[PDB]
Design a protein around this ligand. Structure first.
Ligand SMILES: Nc1nc2c(ncn2[C@@H]2O[C@H](COP(=O)(O)O)[C@@H](O)[C@H]2O)c(=O)[nH]1
Ligand SMILES: [Mg+2]
Ligand SMILES: [Zn+2]
Length: 326
């Protein structure tokens, strides 16, 4: 069997060190890596966060789970594919390690964040929540138009975690498992950008008034939400060649949706979804950095000064895009 062969080869392979895989670097790139290499990188992330040892994960089970996750991202979507999910998880790993965020959270929270990052866009169809709503998608009906995609992504995450041979959370007690799934669900739902915009104000105000308290459960959940967003948008902080390449992937998906909107729904798409504005991608990226990213990475920097490289990377990309916009 082909799938059996893939798993037996992965499970028997040595897992290279974090150093060799460069996964502790905020400026990490997956572009020269094969699919197998990304899976090995993923095993190393779980291992170096002590999740394998601390939660008694069988090596074969972890390997099968990673392959299942990778297989459940679509191969015909330009941006919302396995590489995006993988890069999101690596940014989380780098934030927890080099960003020194791991000392502020428990092992169970770290377990949930890593799983959530890897699973956060599972089976993404390559269209937005609003498009699914306006086209009467079965997903929109099921989730009452609320964070439609994100609910779908969590459902897929749950489906995989429960499938035979993929149960990486079998070592958790029933109480721990209930708790972990709740954190994972909230973390995936947090990647809905509409929710980030809605709640970012409370987070920023807590930092401004020196009242940020991670012992408060509401604020802990809030922080996990902002971290998920920070990881999800982290391509905007990457070295220029990586950000230029990724931005074109994002535009590819957006423009394709816009073409469907114009033809099937008879509506003029917004600028970000309108192919006529391809020449304005630089101004649109600067606009996205100013409205969303800058303040998020500034806030994360106040939380942990070792997260400064994310803010620095974001600022450098704004300079690069603004030069092309002028
Ligand atoms: N304009 C713009 N939006 C982005 C970019 N990267 C992430 N996003 C925004 O943040 C959201 C992240 O959610 P995701 O697309 O991963 O499901 C995107 O849908 C999009 O609205 C970008 O490079 N440019
Ligand atoms: Mg998403
Ligand atoms: Zn995403």
């Amino acid at each position: 069997e082909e799938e059996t062969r893939e798993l037996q080869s992965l499970a028997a392979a040595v897992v290279p060190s974090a150093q060799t895989l460069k996964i502790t670097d905020f400026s990490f790139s997956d572009f020269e890596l094969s699919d197998l290499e990304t899976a090995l990188c993923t095993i190393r992330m779980f291992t170096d966060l002590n999740l394998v040892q601390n939660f008694q994960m069988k090596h074969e089970v972890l390997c099968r789970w990673i392959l299942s996750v990778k297989k459940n991202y679509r191969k015909n979507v330009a941006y919302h594919n396995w590489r995006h999910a993988f890069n999101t998880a690596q940014c989380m790993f780098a934030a927890l390690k080099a960003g020194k965020i791991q000392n502020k959270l428990t092992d169970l929270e770290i377990l949930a964040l890593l799983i959530a990052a890897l699973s956060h866009d599972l089976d993404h169809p390559g269209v937005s929540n609003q498009f699914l709503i306006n086209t009467n998608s079965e997903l929109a009906l099921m989730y009452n138009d609320e964070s439609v995609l994100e609910h779908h992504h969590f459902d897929q995450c749950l489906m995989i975690l429960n499938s035979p041979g993929n149960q990486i959370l079998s070592g958790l007690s029933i109480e721990e498992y209930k708790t972990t799934l709740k954190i994972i669900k909230q973390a995936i739902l947090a990647t809905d950008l509409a929710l980030y915009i809605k709640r970012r104000g409370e987070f920023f105000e807590l930092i401004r008034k020196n009242q940020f308290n991670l012992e408060d459960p509401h604020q802990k959940e809030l922080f996990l939400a902002m971290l998920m967003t920070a990881c999800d948008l982290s391509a905007i902080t990457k070295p220029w060649p990586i950000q230029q390449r990724i931005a074109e992937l994002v535009a590819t998906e957006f423009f394709d949706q816009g073409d469907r909107e114009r033809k099937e729904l008879n509506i003029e798409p917004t600028d970000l979804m309108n192919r006529e504005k391809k020449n304005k991608i630089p101004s649109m990226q600067v606009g996205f950095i100013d409205a969303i990213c800058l303040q998020l990475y500034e806030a994360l920097t106040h939380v942990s000064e070792d997260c400064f490289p994310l803010l620095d990377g974001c600022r450098k990309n704004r300079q690069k895009w603004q030069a092309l916009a002028e």
